[PDB]
Each structure stands twice: as structure tokens, then as C-alpha cells.
Write a protein that binds this ligand. Structure first.
Ligand SMILES: O=C(Nc1ccn2nc(-c3ccccc3)nc2c1)c1ccnc(Cl)c1
Ligand SMILES: [Mg+2]
Ligand SMILES: [Zn+2]
Length: 313
């Protein structure tokens, strides 16, 4: 009850900043997550014994893949923490509980492969879930872990509060399917500009939480250049392995996944910043002004990829 987590001074200060990197010491990441729940939510939100058992089972169900791993889960949770702390009064108690858990759980049991690769492989998950294939799996795995004996962190919620929280988590996790991001943001862009955006309209909140989830999920592009550049290697290591597996199915992969086309990566990063990341953080900033530092960091990294192309690195 009186048992805070407390981080060293540099982490205690930097963890509050959007661009914080959780560092290479795997064994600190659980305490970092508990620290964030305690400050974001309260020391009463969860039974520490049950939270700790939930965190360690979630970790166990992330695989040893180059990018979609336990570090990404915690990184994406930290960006949600930073958004919630900079927007104190905008979110319900349930939302603060639900979203940190949604982020930790959003890529559970990822194999390093896209929804497209599962569909072309004809993987059993593509028959079970025809759209947002991996994302419906990640939610399924979240519910499974919540139902292990001793792992129900939501047990002290009323029946209907419990239903609302699992529904916040389900939508949050589905929204991380980037296929859905384009339409979500266009709708949010129209609503903001015609002034119809209403945060008391549940279907509007859902959309805003969806964009937050895209923003946290993409937050590798909002770090300092050296973190962003080195994370890109992990991202492409998965993409190129998927490319290899496309060639094994007798299918030329898109260039993004073809290791023969490394030379074209800088221009491909540009496209991605221009078509996905910048628009994402721009609309987020319009809706939630204190998230401007994510847009600023993203723009700095666009400019660093522009320098890469001009042979200045
Ligand atoms: O980098 C990310 N996504 C993209 C998107 C489109 N392209 N296209 C190329 C590309 C490369 C070579 C040749 C032509 C095109 N490179 C990328 C990388 C990414 C994904 C998920 N999460 C994060 Cl944080 C970042
Ligand atoms: Mg995902
Ligand atoms: Zn993710």
C-alpha cells in the first residue's frame, strides 16, 4: 500500500519527456511500467501482486523478434503515459487504467510478420480473423492472460466497469492496425475543421483514442535521431525477413521488404513520415495541444532522413 517504485534521478526526470528511451536493461522495464501506472492511475488502481504477475505473463508471451518484442510493448506504453500525464483532466479513471494495459498488450505474441504475410501464407489466424488479423489475436491473448488464476488486475471493478475497460482495450488494440489509421485520421481531420469534434460523444472519443494508439505505436519516429536511426534497423530486419518468406512463397515482396533494395530506404522513410507519421502527430496536436513535442521530434527526424539522402550522412 505504502510501496512506491522509485527510479534513479535521470530516469525519474527523463521518463516524463515524450522522447524518453527505456534503456537496454530489460530487468528495469517492469518497474518502469509499474512506476508509470502508479503516477498515471494511482497506487490503488491494481493489486501490486496481481499487476506484477500480469506484467510477467505479458512479457513471457512476447517473442524474441527484432522489433515487435517486449521492449516495443513498454516503449509504446511509455508514450501513452506521456500523453496521459500532459492531458491530466481529459481522460476518465477507467481510460487511464485501460490504455496503459492496452499499449503493453497491443502486440502480444507477434511473430514479426504482417497481416498480408499471414493471408498469403494462408495461416490459420487469417481464417479465424479476416481483417486486423494479428490485432484480433493480440486482444484474444490479452483476454487469455487476464483469465489466468491470480492475473485479473480488473477484479475490483464492477461488472459494467469491467465491460467498459475490456471494450476500451479491444478498440485501442484494433486501432493499432495501420490499415485503419488513414480513415480514422481523415474523419478526425474533417471533424476538427468543421468544429463537430465532441469529446463527450463516445464514437468521437473512440476515434481520438485510436489516433493516440497510432501515435504511441509509431513513437520510435519521435525519439532523438540516434534512437530512431538504430530502431529503423530492427524495423527493417523484420521487414526483410518477411520479404525473404514472400520469395519462398514465389511472390516478389514490396520494395520495403526486399533486402536487395536497402539503397531505397532513406526515400522510403521520407514517404512514411510524409504519408503516415507527420499527419498522425499533426492531427493529434490539433486535438490534444500538449502532444506538440511528438510532432516537433517527428519533424526533426524527417529532416535527418532528408540529410541522409543529400549524402550529408
Ligand atoms: O518504417 C516504418 N514503415 C515504413 C512504411 C513504408 N515504407 N516504405 C519503405 C521503403 C523502403 C525501401 C524502398 C521503398 C520503400 N520503408 C518504409 C517503412 C514503420 C512501420 C511501423 N512502425 C514504425 Cl515506427 C515505422
Ligand atoms: Mg501491431
Ligand atoms: Zn506495435
Amino acid at each position: 500500500g505504502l510501496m512506491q517504485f522509485t527510479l534513479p534521478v535521470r530516469l525519474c526526470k527523463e521518463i516524463e519527456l515524450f522522447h524518453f528511451d527505456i534503456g537496454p536493461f530489460e530487468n528495469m522495464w517492469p518497474g518502469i511500467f509499474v512506476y508509470m501506472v502508479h503516477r498515471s492511475c494511482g497506487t490503488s488502481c491494481f493489486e501490486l501482486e496481481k499487476l506484477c504477475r500480469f506484467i510477467m505473463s505479458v512479457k513471457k508471451n512476447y517473442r524474441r523478434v527484432p522489433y515487435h518484442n517486449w521492449k516495443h510493448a513498454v516503449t509504446v506504453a511509455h508514450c501513452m503515459y506521456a500523453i496521459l500525464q500532459n492531458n491530466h483532466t481529459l481522460f476518465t479513471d477507467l481510460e487511464r487504467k485501460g490504455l496503459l494495459i492496452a499499449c503493453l498488450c497491443h502486440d502480444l505474441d507477434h511473430r514479426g510478420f504482417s497481416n498480408s504475410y499471414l493471408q498469403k501464407f494462408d495461416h490459420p489466424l487469417a481464417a479465424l480473423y479476416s481483417t486486423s488479423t494479428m490485432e484480433q489475436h493480440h486482444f484474444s491473448q490479452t483476454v487469455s492472460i487476464l483469465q489466468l488464476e491470480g492475473h485479473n488486475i480488473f477484479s475490483t471493478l464492477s461488472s459494467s466497469e469491467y465491460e467498459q475497460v475490456l471494450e476500451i482495450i479491444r478498440k485501442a488494440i484494433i486501432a493499432t492496425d495501420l490499415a485503419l489509421y488513414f480513415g480514422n485520421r481523415k474523419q478526425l481531420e474533417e471533424m476538427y475543421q468543421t468544429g463537430s469534434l465532441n469529446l463527450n460523444n463516445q464514437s468521437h472519443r473512440d476515434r481520438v483514442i485510436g489516433l493516440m494508439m497510432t501515435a504511441c505505436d509509431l513513437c520510435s519516429v519521435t525519439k532523438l535521431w540516434p534512437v530512431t536511426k538504430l530502431t529503423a534497423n530492427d524495423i527493417y530486419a523484420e521487414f526483410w525477413a518477411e520479404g525473404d518468406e514472400m520469395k519462398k512463397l514465389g511472390i516478389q515482396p514490396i520494395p520495403m521488404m526486399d533486402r536487395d533494395k536497402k539503397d531505397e530506404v532513406p526515400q522510403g522513410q521520407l514517404g512514411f513520415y510524409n504519408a503516415v507519421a507527420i499527419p498522425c502527430y499533426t492531427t493529434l496536436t490539433q486535438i490534444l495541444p500538449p502532444t506538440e513535442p511528438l510532432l516537433k521530434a517527428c519533424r526533426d527526424n524527417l529532416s535527418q532522413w532528408e540529410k541522409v539522402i543529400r549524402g550529408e550522412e
